Design an enzyme around this catalytic site. Structure first.
Site, short mmCIF file in Angstrom:
data_model
loop_
_atom_site.label_atom_id
_atom_site.label_comp_id
_atom_site.label_asym_id
_atom_site.label_seq_id
_atom_site.Cartn_x
_atom_site.Cartn_y
_atom_site.Cartn_z
N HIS A 72 0.80 -1.19 0.00
CA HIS A 72 0.08 -0.04 -0.01
C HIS A 72 0.85 1.30 0.19
CE1 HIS A 72 -3.14 -2.93 1.32
NE2 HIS A 72 -3.78 -2.31 0.53
N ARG A 75 2.90 3.78 -5.65
CA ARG A 75 2.67 3.07 -6.74
C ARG A 75 1.48 2.29 -6.89
NH1 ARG A 75 6.58 2.10 -10.63
NH2 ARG A 75 8.12 2.73 -8.73
N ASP A 113 -5.98 5.17 -0.45
CA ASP A 113 -5.36 4.62 0.48
C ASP A 113 -4.18 5.62 1.15
OD1 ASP A 113 -6.01 1.91 0.61
OD2 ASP A 113 -5.06 1.30 -1.05
C1 LIG Z 1 -4.18 -13.26 0.15
C2 LIG Z 1 -5.04 -12.13 -0.60
N1 LIG Z 1 -5.00 -12.09 -2.12
C3 LIG Z 1 -4.90 -11.06 -2.73
N2 LIG Z 1 -5.32 -9.80 -2.43
C4 LIG Z 1 -5.26 -8.50 -2.83
C5 LIG Z 1 -5.21 -8.65 -4.29
C6 LIG Z 1 -5.22 -7.35 -4.44
N3 LIG Z 1 -5.73 -6.38 -3.58
N4 LIG Z 1 -5.73 -7.40 -2.40
C7 LIG Z 1 -6.16 -7.23 -1.28
C8 LIG Z 1 -5.34 -6.10 -0.54
C9 LIG Z 1 -6.43 -5.54 0.52
C10 LIG Z 1 -7.61 -6.37 0.43
C11 LIG Z 1 -7.54 -6.52 -1.00
C12 LIG Z 1 -4.64 -9.76 -4.71
O1 LIG Z 1 -4.33 -9.70 -5.85
N5 LIG Z 1 -4.53 -10.89 -3.89
C13 LIG Z 1 -6.24 -12.14 -0.20
C14 LIG Z 1 -7.01 -11.04 0.39
C15 LIG Z 1 -8.14 -11.20 0.72
C16 LIG Z 1 -9.30 -12.27 0.50
CL1 LIG Z 1 -10.60 -12.50 0.87
C17 LIG Z 1 -8.54 -13.47 -0.10
C18 LIG Z 1 -7.08 -13.44 -0.33
MG LIG Z 2 -7.68 0.50 1.13
ZN LIG Z 3 -6.02 0.24 -2.32
#
Ligand SMILES: C[C@@H](Nc1nc2c(cnn2C2CCCC2)c(=O)[nH]1)c1ccc(Cl)cc1
Ligand SMILES: [Mg+2]
Ligand SMILES: [Zn+2]
Ligand SMILES: C[C@H](Nc1nc2c(cnn2C2CCCC2)c(=O)[nH]1)c1ccc(Cl)cc1
Ligand SMILES: [Mg+2]
Ligand SMILES: [Zn+2]
Lengths: 326, 322
Positions: A72, A75, A113
């Site tokens: 976070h 970028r 963010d």
């Molecule tokens: C391990 C994680 N995977 C993941 N999480 C991601 C991605 C993009 N943003 N996020 C999260 C970052 C904050 C929230 C969304 C991504 O590509 N993969 C993940 C997060 C939430 C759940 Cl419900 C399942 C897997």
């Molecule tokens: Mg956020």
């Molecule tokens: Zn975000």
């Protein structure tokens, strides 16, 4: 001669309109120029009388208020705004949305963010942090991102809205708040359900229908890394896990609950992504495709490929595990 | 003075209690008594000295506004206490729910600045910006409440297990946020929907009832006897006129209902009593019929009296026009 990097070439300008843009090529100054160009190119400078110098200062202050977290960071902010920019062109959003709405989308994307500390809401709440106490356990981060956004915009030298009438400002403010608060993943199923409900008979005239579409659009861009070409997307997964593992380590160290999907001992790059792609990303983008069929080829297609790729990678991982215990 | 007489302790259980007689320390004593008397000190192992420090700290964090001050906080908590007896709430509610109701009532206006949410938002204040125009005052009161409880010597919940604390915290947040009058019609509509077939074992039904209860207590001044109630109206106008004065000299919109040139004591109350208080207590009465005689009755008398006052006010204006 050769022009300095903060002068964007016409090739970059062209590539910036497209979700294939390599976000890793560019340093902060170059990304800042990219964002600046978006506001001119979308006619927001023109239509809201944005002082071009204020626009530059504003983007610098925004940049300064993102922290150097693994995931976070500035970028990420750039990725999300650039994906919003891409989607404006892909989905011809200027046909459907007013210029005020495009402004809300773009500005919310940049600000969403701000000053993220690298530990999510569950950490805030369980650790009873200053932020959790300040916001009474209600989306503490997203409330804080939005608060910082308007602290910045209240400084006269960063106020890109200084030439907007008060009524316009109120409308823009409220819209941005709605959009930034919508990025709390705790609310994902709630928001999708509301959006699917309206989709039964969608109405671009209906302001509530459009509010939900905009919430879905920013949610799409926020988690859109896997829509990008594989070489652009892959590194983000490492950034994510670095941040997530930092939090779970800390929670272990402080005796706080640890979420399995964030646990350094249980998570692989493949397990991090598969379910997320299949059950969060794909269905969300499927619903958007119903209004914007062009999205299927440009964004669903790479998600399908990424799903298959990570599923295969998991089989390989599992076989390798099985081999060292057989 | 510091020691409450048995007469006082007894009078404290009724909505006729004269809230104006007492100074801060005696009000603090009254609140302490309520926690002991309700069984809250017993059932939550509240340290008796911590309870008194907590109340002192709470007091310290109320400001000297004409209306939104520590005595208002006392009135709301004292009315909640009264409603616990009147409506026999201990048969319907757990002790955890009683604790939430009482603690929320004491904390619900902590550090109020004396200008309402409309001012905060229109003037783009630090609080409105912090809370994104979403019930900024009520979010602030709540935050200050748990900042206070986070001080160990003020932590009346220090012997509650973590699960219990989380339940209490969630409950208090819901109730304090429910006091934002912007949400009044929404919350009333939700509650009247549940009142179509009310169910004491439905948590969602009980949450709404508790929201209605703290709301009743927050705006309950006019339920009290006239001599106790009337001075609150002066305080109200004084605080509100301060804001409308300020809004005028800063170029911000002014609501006619707070306009020093348009508002009388009577016109401030008649509509409020008729279209806010009476209907709310009518709905509560359907659950608790004893409420009608003890609370709706004074509201009818106040309504009638202010309508009489209004006729004299109007006659006086006939002698002043030109
Ligand atoms: C391990 C994680 N995977 C993941 N999480 C991601 C991605 C993009 N943003 N996020 C999260 C970052 C904050 C929230 C969304 C991504 O590509 N993969 C993940 C997060 C939430 C759940 Cl419900 C399942 C897997
Ligand atoms: Mg956020
Ligand atoms: Zn975000
Ligand atoms: C309509 C309102 N009247 C009113 N408002 C009251 C009372 C008690 N609390 N409150 C309000 C304080 C904010 C929660 C409602 C009350 O007894 N009367 C009002 C009229 C004129 C002015 Cl100047 C201010 C308020
Ligand atoms: Mg209040
Ligand atoms: Zn109050």
């Amino acid at each position: 001669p050769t022009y300095p990097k903060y002068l964007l070439s016409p090739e970059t300008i062209e590539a910036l309109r497209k979700p294939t843009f390599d976000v890793w090529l560019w340093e902060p100054n170059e990304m800042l120029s990219c964002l600046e160009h978006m506001y001119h190119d979308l006619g927001l400078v023109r239509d809201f009388s944005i002082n071009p110098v204020t626009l530059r200062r504003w983007l610098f202050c925004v940049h300064d208020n993102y922290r150097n977290n693994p995931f976070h960071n500035f970028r990420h902010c750039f990725c999300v705004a650039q994906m919003m920019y891409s989607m404006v062109w892909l989905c011809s959003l200027q046909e459907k949305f007013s210029q005020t709405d495009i402004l809300i989308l773009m500005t919310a994307a940049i600000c969403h963010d701000l000053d993220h500390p690298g530990y999510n809401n569950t950490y805030q709440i369980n650790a009873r942090t200053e932020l959790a106490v300040r916001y009474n356990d209600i989306s503490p981060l997203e409330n804080h991102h939005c608060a910082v956004a308007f602290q910045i915009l209240a400084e006269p030298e960063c106020n890109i809205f200084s030439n907007i009438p008060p009524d316009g400002f109120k409308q823009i403010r409220q819209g941005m708040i709605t959009l930034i608060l919508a990025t709390d993943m705790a609310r994902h199923a709630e928001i999708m359900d509301s959006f699917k409900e309206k989709m039964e008979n969608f109405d671009y005239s209906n302001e509530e229908h459009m509010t939900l579409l905009k919430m879905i659009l920013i949610k799409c861009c926020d988690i859109s890394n896997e829509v990008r070409p594989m070489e652009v997307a892959e590194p983000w997964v490492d950034c994510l896990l670095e941040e997530y593992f930092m939090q779970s380590d800390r929670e272990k160290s402080e005796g706080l609950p640890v979420a399995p999907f964030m646990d350094r001992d249980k998570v692989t790059k493949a397990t991090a992504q598969i379910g997320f792609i299949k059950f969060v990303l794909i269905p969300m983008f499927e619903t958007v495709t119903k209004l914007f069929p062009m999205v299927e080829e440009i964004m669903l297609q790479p998600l399908w490929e990424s799903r298959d790729r990570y599923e295969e990678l998991k089989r390989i991982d599992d076989a390798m595990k099985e081999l060292q215990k057989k």
